[PDB]
Design a protein around this nucleic acid. Structure first.
Lengths: 156, 97, 117, 126, 60, 80, 210
RNA sequence: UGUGGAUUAAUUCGAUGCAACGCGAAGAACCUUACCUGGGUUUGACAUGCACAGGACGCCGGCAGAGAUGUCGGUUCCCUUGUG
RNA sequence: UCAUGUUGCCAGCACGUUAUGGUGGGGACUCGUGAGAGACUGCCGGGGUCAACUCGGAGGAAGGUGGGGAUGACGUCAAGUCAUCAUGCCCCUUAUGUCCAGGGCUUCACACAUGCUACAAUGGCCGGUACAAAGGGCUGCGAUGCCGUGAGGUGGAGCGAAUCCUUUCAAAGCCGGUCUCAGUUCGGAUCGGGGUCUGCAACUCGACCCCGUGAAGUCGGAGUCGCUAGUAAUCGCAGAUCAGCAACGCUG
């Protein structure tokens, strides 16, 4: 319900196995639309696989990855005077978290491992360390939002 | 035992018919099981309401099939005769099972 | 390994090796491997030449295989043309034989969608 | 004993309740067989997670209708209203923490001329 | 829906497969059911008239 | 495939035709089987609707039925 | 036009009742055919006299036919001359013994179908359409406890080639409101130049009737 | 699958963005057919009214015939005397 | 919430001993539906005209029209329907009437639209685990059993039916193994044999079965659509027109 104010959102519970909101949001984003229990198993096995390959708590590793992927400035698609002038806008924490997790899932399904369990585990690792597609996209979006500061004072 | 399965298209009409059957049974004298509504039966048929092609705004037709179960126990000839002697609504069909 | 003439790839199960053949498909792969005594899970690399000979004899004797399926399908196709049948006429005009869609679909017969002027 | 009716989309469960060492009796199954998803476990235990009665209290559930997650939610609601029945003080705690409010959110009525309810089919007007 | 065609479908067929519905009230042969044996355009008009004992609007 | 068509009128016509060992172009309205092998040698003028187009019956003629052995779907669909 | 759902087709389970009432197991189609045949039999001669309603109920397969007419004497003339003749005709046509029931509407033209009947007869009577309207419209409201009316007409009004229409409203006639009890009446006059359809909506009141 | 374009005997007809084209068509080997080719009926397949013969028609079968249709085989009126 | 125990569920009870409420009984609970209650900002606080309205809290299952439907004022676009139907008018009356034969209406060198299938390993093959409701059913469900690779054949119980068939109602999901990111166990086209049933007859002109078929397509270009929560999306089931099905459709 836009044009009327902030839109109410569905609340999110923590993971039963793990107990973290980021874990459950990652589950729902890796969730191929139609199945959850199998998607939950896949994200699970991915998180344990990240666990032994990191030796730490998968929730903390996912938090580190999300921080290494969370954006700070977003670019909309406003048309100003018939010319595409990019207006960067500060991102709210929920929107930035959603963007980071969406990027993580999108580049997780891109990987070429045997299973998307392995693909998601490798994506988690490559976002935590800072050598994955999600991290480089986080760098590129900030680079492009800083390259167009001349249009940043529009304040929309 | 007599299973008077009365069926009517109106819930209140069948309710009244079942109550009148129960009262006739009680007046003549016989055991009565409390009114047990059978769940339903539903057929959904759709129709393209247009003299020609207008596939938009179809309409689906329904019907109410209310069924009440009163398992009359130990019937009497003065009850059985009254079962088919008079049925004022004549819109509730009685199956004797 | 060696077979009637359809390759059995290095990383395909035995039923999976069979499924590639025109003569044998997945269901016939299961049937043949049950009748002969070869696992549907074992690889082509784990295959034995004696089992190869037994399998080849069984398939060539009790199953329509590459050659048998050709001499069946194409011979009866030309049979239904030579009787003038409209199954034959579906064959001739590049149409599905059972009279199903030829107007726009049936690309595997007439050939892919194209474009006229 | 005390029985609880948990109503879901179309999953309705009648549950007998009794204090005792935590047991979970389904329609011929335990809790560790009916919910192998390892997710509905804590979901159904959530009313038991909130008020500490996971193992001090018991459940003899008989379900009818619905599916795995739906019957998990029905069993969960049965647990919540059962905790209401046992301790009246549990009801305000569950209501405050968020419980005891049924969800009328079911698969809504399909709209005629649409692939799904609230789903307009893809189109290309000429 | 010619009266000749109506009588033709009403007349006996020489094959067991020639039988079809051909709704008699109006003459439309297509989209005719078993429970009522009529066409859609006449079905809606009869149904809106209330003469049918039981059909009403559906709303759940 | 319990039983194919018998061409009852065409069956009697063909029986009368070949019992006398005389070959005649039977203006055959029937178009629903050539399953019976005895039709060989009989010039079935298949009534495709427009006329009675002759069709000959062979040994491998079995397995498919009599109708568009003479085609009825006159088609060119492109310039002609 | 505007998707005006039939008021009797919309409040048939709320305020108004069905003309026919019975129950039939694996017997619906033949009952529908019998109803259609009986209503077709009673179509022209009854509407010329001013018929209002035709109810067909089913007793234990013998008969129940009620015809509500707006004038006694035409349907039942000399005792046995008219009522018994049509009763015997129904007995012959329908495979049942017909004890035909004929009852008279207590008031003059006050039904939507009756108003449409009068309006169409006047329009066929070469009178000024307007007159016919207003006149029959005045003769429409009537309905002792009357609250609202909506008189509509369409088709070759006055014999012209254009299918013109007229709309007249009086008082409360909430079609949308379900506690409306709005009677619907549609009748088509067959003029020399064509046909004229007449619609009457009669809003009795705001009573729920529940 | 339907529509447009083209063949065709027909590829039935209309609907042609919204408000046509997984449409009327919630169902084309006969049927559906509305189209064509060909064969029959011609007050006609279907009826109504005036007669005029009438006690037959009409049915149960055979045959020819693509089938319509035609051939007759056998029954032959029920009213109540006006004739229906 | 009251009522309500049968065909239905079965805690409180017994009998089944396998077949599960299945049975005797059990109203206790849904269930089943008859009635009713219960969202009406019902209470409170805050702005606001001391007003509407708004916000927030509380009781409340529902909170601020509870939700889903059912509501088409005036009129709007000669949109569409003389092929639903009648209809003014014109035409044939012996034909454009009329029955039947056969065909086509399914034809295709294509354009578009809509869908299923995919283009996989979230998946393909193989096997096991447990849950749906609505239904629909008298010449119809039609089961058990069996021949059957599998259609299909028998076959008729219980069935005008909460009883019996639809399975004591699923699938996705859970698990295990394989397959190992590929023209693939993808994916199904494609057609051939033989049949199998319905159908007088399946070449146009049904479908299915045993086998085999393994194409394109390796996720789509311009451009485009839908979706504000049970929503997008996935999977399965049923119902109608259906003797045979073009249905991957429509209604749920």
């Amino acid at each position: 319900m836009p044009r009327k104010g902030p839109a109410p959102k569905r609340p999110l519970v923590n993971d039963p196995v793990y107990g973290s909101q980021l874990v459950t949001q990652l589950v729902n984003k890796v969730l191929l639309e139609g199945k959850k229990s199998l998607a939950e198993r896949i994200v699970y096995g991915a998180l344990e696989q990240a666990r032994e390959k990191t030796g730490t708590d998968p929730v903390v590793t996912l938090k580190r990855a999300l921080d290494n992927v969370k954006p700070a400035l977003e670019v909309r698609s406003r048309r100003v005077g018939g010319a595409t002038y990019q207006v960067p806008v500060e991102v709210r924490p929920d929107r930035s978290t959603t963007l980071a997790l969406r990027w993580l899932v999108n580049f997780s399904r891109q990987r070429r491992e045997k299973t998307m369990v392995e693909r998601l585990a490798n994506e988690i690792l490559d976002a935590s360390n800072g050598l994955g597609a999600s991290v480089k996209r986080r760098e590129d979006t900030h680079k492009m939002a800083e390259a167009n500061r001349a249009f940043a004072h529009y304040r929309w | 035992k007599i299973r008077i399965r009365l069926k009517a298209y109106d819930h209140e009409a069948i309710d009244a018919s079942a109550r009148k059957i129960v009262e006739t049974v009680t007046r003549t004298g016989a055991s009565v099981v409390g009114p047990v509504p059978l769940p339903t039966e539903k057929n959904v048929y759709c129709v393209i309401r247009s003299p020609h092609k207008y596939k938009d705004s179809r309409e689906h037709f329904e019907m109410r099939t209310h069924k009440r179960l009163i398992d009359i126990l130990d019937p009497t000839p003065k009850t059985v005769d009254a079962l088919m002697r008079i049925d004022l609504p004549a819109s509730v069909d009685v199956n004797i099972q | 390994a060696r077979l009637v003439g359809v390759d059995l790839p290095r990383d395909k199960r035995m039923e999976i090796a069979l499924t590639y053949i025109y003569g044998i498909g997945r269901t016939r792969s299961n049937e043949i491997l049950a009748a002969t005594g070869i696992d549907k899970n074992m690889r082509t690399k784990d295959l034995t030449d004696d089992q190869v000979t037994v399998l080849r004899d069984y398939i060539e004797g009790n199953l329509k295989v590459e050659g048998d399926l050709r001499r069946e399908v194409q011979a009866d196709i030309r049979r239904k043309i030579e009787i003038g049948c409209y199954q034959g006429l579906r064959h001739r005009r590049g149409l599905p034989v059972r009279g199903q869609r030829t107007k726009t679909n049936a690309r595997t017969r007439k050939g892919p969608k194209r474009t006229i002027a | 004993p005390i029985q609880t009716v948990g109503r879901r989309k179309e999953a309705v469960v009648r549950v007998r309740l009794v204090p005792g060492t935590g047991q979970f009796n389904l329609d011929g199954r335990t809790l560790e067989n009916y919910f192998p998803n390892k997710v509905h476990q804590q979901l159904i235990k959530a009313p038991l997670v909130t008020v500490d009665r996971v193992d001090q209290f018991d459940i003899y559930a008989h379900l009818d209708g619905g599916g795995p997650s739906g019957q998990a939610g029905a069993l969960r609601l049965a647990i919540a209203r059962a905790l209401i029945l046992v301790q009246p003080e549990d009801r305000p705690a569950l209501k405050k923490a968020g419980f005891l409010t049924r969800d009328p959110r079911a698969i809504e009525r399909k709209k005629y001329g649409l692939k799904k309810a609230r789903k307009a089919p893809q189109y290309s007007k000429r | 829906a010619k009266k000749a065609l109506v009588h033709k479908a009403n007349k006996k067929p020489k094959f067991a497969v020639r039988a079809y519905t051909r709704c008699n009230k109006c003459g439309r042969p297509h989209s005719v059911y078993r429970k009522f044996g009529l066409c859609r355009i006449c079905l809606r008009e009869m149904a809106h008239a209330g003469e049918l004992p039981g059909v009403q609007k559906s709303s759940w | 495939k319990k039983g194919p068509f018998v061409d009852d009128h065409l069956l009697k016509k063909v029986d009368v035709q070949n019992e006398k060992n005389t070959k005649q172009v039977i203006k055959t309205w029937s178009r629903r089987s050539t399953i019976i092998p005895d039709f060989i040698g009989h010039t079935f003028a298949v009534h495709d609707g427009r006329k009675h187009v002759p069709v000959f019956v062979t040994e491998a003629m079995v397995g498919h039925k009599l109708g568009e052995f003479a085609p009825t779907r006159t088609f060119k669909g492109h310039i002609k | 036009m505007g998707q005006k759902i039939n008021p009797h087709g919309f409040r048939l389970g709320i305020t108004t009742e069905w003309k026919s009432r019975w129950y039939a197991d694996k017997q619906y189609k033949d009952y529908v055919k019998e109803d259609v045949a009986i209503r077709k039999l009673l179509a022209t001669g009854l509407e010329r006299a001013g018929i209002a309603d035709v109810e067909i109920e089913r007793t234990r397969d013998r008969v129940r036919v009620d015809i509500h007419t707006a004038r006694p004497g035409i349907v039942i003339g000399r005792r046995g001359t008219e009522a018994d003749r049509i009763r015997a005709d129904l007995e012959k046509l329908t495979g049942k013994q017909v004890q035909l029931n004929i009852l008279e509407v207590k008031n003059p033209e006050s039904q939507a179908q009756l108003v449409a009947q009068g309006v169409a007869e006047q329009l066929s009577n070469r009178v000024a359409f307007r007159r016919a309207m207003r006149k029959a419209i005045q003769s429409a409201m009537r309905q002792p406890n009357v609250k609202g009316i909506r008189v509509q007409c369409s088709g070759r009004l006055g014999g012209a080639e254009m299918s013109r229409s007229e709309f007249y409203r009086e008082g409360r006639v909430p079609l949308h409101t379900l506690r409306a009890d709005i009677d619907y009446g549609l009748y088509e006059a067959k003029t020399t130049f064509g046909r004229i359809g007449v619609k009457v909506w009669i809003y009795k009141g705001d009573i729920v009737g529940g």
